[PDB]
Write a protein that binds this ligand. Structure first.
Ligand SMILES: NC(=O)c1ccc[n+]([C@@H]2O[C@H](COP(=O)([O-])OP(=O)(O)OC[C@H]3O[C@@H](n4cnc5c(N)ncnc54)[C@H](OP(=O)(O)O)[C@@H]3O)[C@@H](O)[C@H]2O)c1
Ligand SMILES: NC(=O)c1ccc[n+]([C@@H]2O[C@H](COP(=O)([O-])OP(=O)(O)OC[C@H]3O[C@@H](n4cnc5c(N)ncnc54)[C@H](OP(=O)(O)O)[C@@H]3O)[C@@H](O)[C@H]2O)c1
Lengths: 410, 408
C-alpha cells in the first residue's frame, strides 16, 4: 500500500530475548509495510554490547541526541548469573541508565488503559504517570557501619573560600554501634527534572504534582519545591493556564493517599527513591506490565527515547527457546513505536505520520477492547485463565496486523 | 461486673474524637468493667497548661502499669499555635510517648466483609510496622552554595578500639543539596523484637523490606539484625504457629502487596513506613476502621489508639450545631485491643471475653443490623442520607447490641 515518508531518520535500539522476538514481528507486520523510514539501527543485545565493549550503547545515545527520537526494545541488565550465561567480559552497566544520563532528561512511565481490562484499583480509569528524578539521592549515596561510640559530621569544604564558606555539621553522637549514610543532589539536575516535567505535562494536557517530605527535610526537599516553583512561574504558568491545567507541590503523604483514592488522570513527579517504589505500586495497580509504557524527555524538549516499561520477559523467552507455547503481550512494545513515531511526526511537522501512529494504537487496543483477542496477562485480569480466553504471542500480533490493514484503508 | 486486675492508663484527647471517647467509656466500658482508670487529660489545653507535662506523666504511667488507651490528640503547628494561642509549638504527643516507651507502632485496618475496600481483593488486614527511630526524621540536611567537597567523618570516642572514617561523599561542580542520617543497632534490634512478637501474637507472616541492593551497608544492617534476632529467639515459635519471616526488596514487597488479598505484616524503615501506611489505609477504606498499637521490645508494654486524627472537619460541624456522622469503630477498638492486652497480661480470660464481644457487637451493628456512619455507607456506594446514621445514633446502636450480646 501507500507508504508515509518519514522525513527525519529514526533511531532504533534492538534488545534481546523475548522482546527482541516480538520487536522483529512488530516491525515487519506493523511498521515497515506503511512507512518509508530510515532506521539508524543499533543492536543493544547483550551479545552485541559485550562485543563492542558496550560502545554501541553510547553510540546509540549519541545517535538519539543527533536525530531526536529513539525507539528502544527491552535489554538485559547483566548481573552475576548473566556474566556466566553469555560469557561476558564483565557486568556491564544497564544500557537504560547509560543512555538516560547521556541524554539528560527524565523518564515518565504511563500505563495504557483498556476499559475491558479491570485494574486492581478498579476506580482508576485514567493513567497516572510517574516521573522519576534518577540523579543521585540514595542511588549514589555513601553508607557505612559505625563500630562504636563517636561523633558523625558532614563536612563541606568549598573549592573557592572567597565566595562560599565551609560547613561542618554535627550529625549524631553514637552511644553504641550502628549505621550512617550521606547523599547529595544538585540544582542543575533538579532544574532539568522540573523543565522535563512541565513540558510533558503540557504535551499530555495533564495536571502535574510534585511530591516531597519538605516538612522534615526542610532544606533538601525544600530545594526541589523551590526550584520547581521558580521554573514554573518564570516559564510555564501562562502555558499551563491556557490549557486549563495546574501545577502544585503536595506532601508525599497526602499525594500518595489522594492517588489511590482518585480515578487517575494526572502526573506525579517524584524523587529518585519515591519514583522507584511508587512506579512499581502504580504499575501493579493498573495491572499487567504489558500495558506499561515509558518516554524519556529532555529539558529542552527536543530529544526523546521511547520504550516499553517492562523487561525482556526472560521467563517467556525460556519457553520460546524450547518451542513451548507463550502468551507475551506486545502492546507496550507497539506503543514504544507509536509514541516514538508520534514524537517524530511532531518534530518534523508531518501530520501524516502522527495520524498513522494514532491508528496503530487504535488498531492495537480495539483488538482487545472490541474483538476480545488478548494474551494471558490480560485475560487474568478478567478472571479467565481457560486456554480459550487468551491467545498466543504470535496469534495476538496476527490479530492486530489484520486489524491495522483494515483501519488503514481510511 | 468484670474485675480488671491491673490499672488501665487512659489518655483523653481533643476535638471530635474527645466527644466520642466520653460516650464510649460511659456507654460501652464503665457499665461492664470494674476498672481503675489512671486518667490523663491530653487535650491541647491541658498540654499547653502543663507545658506538655501531662504527656510525659502519661507515658511514664503506661510504662508503669503496662497498657494505655489513647484518644486522638492535636499535634501543634504554626496554625494551631495561633488557634489556641499556644505558648510553644509542642511536639507530637504520640512521638513523645513513643520515645519514653521505646517500642514500634503497628497499623492494622479493621476489615468488615460487607464493606468493600478500594483495592477489592484485600479481605485480610495488611499491618504496617514503622521503625520511627530516625533516618530522614533525625537527619541533618543543608544547601551547598557551590563547588567544593563533601565528606562523612567519624571520630571514635576510643581511638584504641575503633578506627576513624573520612569518606568522600561527593565533589560538587555546582550548587546543590546535602544530607546525612543515621540509625543504631540498638533501635534496629528493638524494632526487630517488637515486629516478631506482633507477628506471633497476630499469627501472621512477617516481611521486612529494604533497599539492601543499593544501600548495601545501611539496609543490609536491618536485614542481618532481623535474621540474627529471628534465629536467636523467634524461629521455633514461628515454626510452631505455621508463620514465616522473610526479607524482601521493597520493589518486590510493594508489588506483591497490591496483588495480594492481604493477610500479613510488613515491617518498614521510618520513611517507607510513613508513606506505605497511608497507601494501605486508603486501600482498605475509611480511616474510621484504622487501628494501631505501640509494642515495646520486651513485649510487656502497649499503647492502643485509633489510627486516625481528631476529625477536625467534623468537629466544626459539631460546633455549628450541625449533625455529624463520625465513625467511632476505630476508637472503640482502641479500647477493646487495649483491654485485650490488659487481660492477656493479667491472665483474666473474663476481660478478654468482654473485649471480643465488644468488637463483635460493634462490627455486627454494621455487618448485620446494617447501621453505619456516612463514611461506610459511601464505601458501599450508598450516597443517600437515609443510608447512614449520626455519630451518636451509631453509638446508641452498638450500646443496645452490646447489651444483647452480653446477655449470653
Ligand atoms: N531494558 C529495560 O527497559 C528493562 C527493564 C526491566 C528489566 N529488564 C531486564 O529484563 C530481564 C528480565 O527482567 P524481569 O525478570 O523483571 O522480567 P520482566 O521483563 O520485567 O517481566 C517480569 C514478569 O512480568 C510479566 N510480564 C512482563 N512483561 C510482560 C508482557 N509483555 N507480557 C506478558 N507478561 C509480561 C511476566 O510474568 P509471568 O512470568 O508470570 O508471565 C514476566 O515474567 C532482566 O535482564 C532485567 O534486567 C530490562
Ligand atoms: N493522635 C493521633 O493519632 C493523630 C493522628 C493523625 C492526626 N492527628 C491530628 O488531627 C489533626 C489533623 O486532622 P486531619 O486533618 O488529619 O483529619 P483526620 O482526623 O486525620 O481525618 C481526615 C478525614 O478523614 C475522614 N475521617 C477520619 N476519621 C474519621 C472517622 N472516624 N469517621 C469518619 N470519617 C473520618 C474524614 O474525611 P471527610 O471530611 O471526607 O468526612 C476526615 O475529615 C491535627 O491535630 C493532627 O495532629 C492526630
Amino acid at each position: 500500500f501507500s507508504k508515509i515518508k518519514v522525513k527525519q531518520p529514526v533511531v532504533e535500539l534492538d534488545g534481546d530475548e523475548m522482546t527482541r522476538i516480538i520487536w522483529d514481528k512488530i516491525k515487519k507486520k506493523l511498521i515497515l509495510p506503511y512507512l518509508d523510514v530510515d532506521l539508524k539501527y543499533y543492536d543493544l543485545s547483550v551479545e552485541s554490547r559485550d562485543a563492542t565493549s558496550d560502545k554501541i550503547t553510547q553510540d546509540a545515545a549519541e545517535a538519539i541526541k543527533k536525530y531526536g527520537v529513539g525507539i528502544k526494545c527491552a535489554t538485559i541488565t547483566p548481573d552475576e548469573a548473566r556474566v556466566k550465561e553469555f560469557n561476558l567480559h564483565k557486568m556491564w552497566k544497564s544500557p537504560n541508565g547509560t543512555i538516560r544520563n547521556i541524554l539528560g532528561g527524565t523518564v515518565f512511565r504511563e500505563p495504557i488503559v483498556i476499559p475491558r481490562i479491570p485494574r486492581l484499583v478498579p476506580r482508576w480509569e485514567k493513567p497516572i504517570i510517574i516521573g522519576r528524578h534518577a540523579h543521585g539521592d540514595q542511588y549514589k549515596a555513601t553508607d557505612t557501619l559505625i563500630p562504636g561510640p563517636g561523633s558523625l559530621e558532614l563536612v563541606y569544604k568549598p573549592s573557592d573560600p572567597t565566595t562560599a564558606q565551609p560547613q561542618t555539621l554535627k550529625v549524631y553522637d553514637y552511644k553504641g554501634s550502628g549505621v550512617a549514610m550521606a547523599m547529595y543532589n544538585t540544582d542543575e539536575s533538579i532544574e532539568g527534572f522540573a523543565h522535563s516535567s512541565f513540558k510533558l505535562a503540557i504535551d499530555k494536557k495533564l495536571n502535574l504534582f510534585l511530591s516531597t517530605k519538605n516538612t522534615i527535610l526542610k532544606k533538601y526537599d525544600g530545594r526541589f519545591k523551590d526550584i520547581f516553583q521558580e521554573v514554573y512561574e518564570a516559564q510555564y504558568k501562562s502555558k499551563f493556564e491556557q490549557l486549563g491545567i495546574h501545577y502544585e507541590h503536595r506532601l508525599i503523604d497526602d499525594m500518595v493517599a489522594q492517588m489511590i483514592k482518585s480515578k487517575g488522570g494526572f502526573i506525579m513527579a517524584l524523587k529518585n527513591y519515591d519514583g522507584d517504589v511508587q512506579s512499581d505500586i502504580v504499575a501493579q495497580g493498573f495491572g499487567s506490565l504489558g500495558l506499561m509504557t515509558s518516554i524519556l524527555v529532555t529539558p529542552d524538549g527536543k530529544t526523546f527515547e521511547s520504550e516499553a516499561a517492562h523487561g525482556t520477559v526472560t521467563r517467556h523467552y525460556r519457553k520460546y527457546q524450547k518451542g513451548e507455547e507463550t502468551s507475551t503481550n506486545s502492546i507496550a512494545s507497539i506503543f514504544a513505536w507509536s509514541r516514538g513515531l508520534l514524537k517524530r511526526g511532531e518534530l518534523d511537522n508531518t501530520p501524516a505520520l502522527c495520524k498513522f501512529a494514532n491508528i496503530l494504537e487504535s488498531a492495537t487496543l480495539n483488538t482487545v477492547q472490541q474483538d476480545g483477542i488478548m494474551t494471558k496477562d490480560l485475560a487474568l485480569a478478567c478472571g479467565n485463565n481457560e486456554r480459550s480466553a487468551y491467545v498466543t504471542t504470535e496469534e495476538f500480533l496476527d490479530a492486530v496486523e489484520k486489524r491495522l490493514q483494515k483501519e488503514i484503508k481510511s
